[PDB]
From a paper:
Chitin, a linear polymer of β-(1,4) linked N-acetylglucosamine (GlcNAc) forms the rigid inner layer of the cell wall and is also partially hydrolysed during morphogenesis. This is performed by glycoside hydrolase family 18 (GH18) chitinases that catalyse the cleavage of β-(1,4) glycosidic bonds between GlcNAc residues. In contrast, “plant-type” enzymes are predominantly cell wall associated endochitinases. Here we describe the discovery of novel, low micromolar chemical inhibitors of Aspergillus fumigatus family 18 plant-type chitinase A1 (AfChiA1) by high-throughput screening (HTS).
AfChiA1 crystals were soaked with compound 1, diffraction data were collected and scaled to 1.9 Å resolution, the AfChiA1-compound 1 complex structure solved by molecular replacement and refined to an Rfree of 0.22. Electron density corresponding to the ligand (compound 1) was observed in the active site for both molecules in the asymmetric unit. Compound 1 consists of two ring systems, an isoxazolopyrimidine stacking on Trp312 and an attached methoxybenzene. The pyrimidine moiety inserts deeply into the AfChiA active site and thus is likely most important for binding. Residues lining the AfChiA1 active site form a number of hydrogen bonds with the ligand: the N1 ring atom donates a hydrogen bond to the side chain of Asp172, while the pyrimidine carbonyl group originating from the C2 position accepts a hydrogen bond from the backbone amine of Ala124 and the N5 ring atom accepts a third hydrogen bond from the side chain hydroxyl of Tyr232. The isoxazolo moiety points out of the binding cleft. The methoxyphenyl moiety makes limited van der Waals contacts with the side chains of Trp312, Gln37, Phe60 and Ala124, but otherwise points towards the bulk solvent suggesting that the ring could be replaced.
Numbering used by the authors: 29 to 337
Amino acid sequence: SNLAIYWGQGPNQLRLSHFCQETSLDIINIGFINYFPDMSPGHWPGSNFGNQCDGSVYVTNDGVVTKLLSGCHQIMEDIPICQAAGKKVLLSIGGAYPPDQSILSEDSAVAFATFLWGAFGPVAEGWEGPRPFGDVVVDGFDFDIEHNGGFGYATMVNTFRQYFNQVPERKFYLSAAPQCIIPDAQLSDAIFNAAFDFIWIQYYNTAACSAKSFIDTSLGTFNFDAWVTVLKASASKDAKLYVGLPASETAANQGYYLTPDEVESLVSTYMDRYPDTFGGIMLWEATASENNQIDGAPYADHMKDILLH
Ligand SMILES: COc1ccccc1-c1noc2nc(C)[nH]c(=O)c12
């Protein structure tokens, strides 16, 4: 039913508003808040959106240079277009670079979520901190934690929910991007102990359980069945599960991209098998989709057709 895509790390990517105009996209995850407070300058989080933003950064009130970008003008301009078009825009935390970020304590997990809520959530009279996207309010937060284990993330999720519940008139969302092996070293703890709305399983780069292994069963064993089972047991039991795929041949490691016809064979099986739990498709990522035109349309448009068929 829904199609989610990452944007922000594509080489020479088009600006976000280009993807705000793409009807087929339902959810866009903007990557990334990639530096975490415990190990970053000023103890502020830091951000990177590839070729976007003017390169300026915030300083702390004592003059310490942070890694949080302060001139993301096109992003600020573009998010409201996405939302006007009915898309959900989630700010993604983590991403694969750098490899050395984690959360060291319960207190800092809570403080990280508090900061992000203040900086990127609803505008509040009592916040005197940075507003990197101005008066824009994101639709929630994606946990793309790719290194260093699982500590802290459940606490962050729970903290965000407490905050969401103070704004009962607006819906916000939380998501996670585990890889396919169960247990997932970064996110099984958060999925077991806290409640995500969406979970997109990355079904590329691990041979044991990839989407490609549905097509060629000699490679591995595609394990969406196992993920349904593990979720029914978790605090995330009401999450919808998405199949995460590369949007071109070069978006991930060699051998993990599926043709539209291959995706249709997988999705038809699994959407039929799990009509309530199967949420849709997630794509890595917007620029690879856009650059992979098939019969005059980007890969993402072909994915939505499969989902609606
Ligand atoms: C290890 O793979 C990566 C290294 C650096 C930057 C991005 C990736 C990456 N490849 O597929 C991905 N998929 C997700 C959800 N997040 C990522 O960071 C990546």
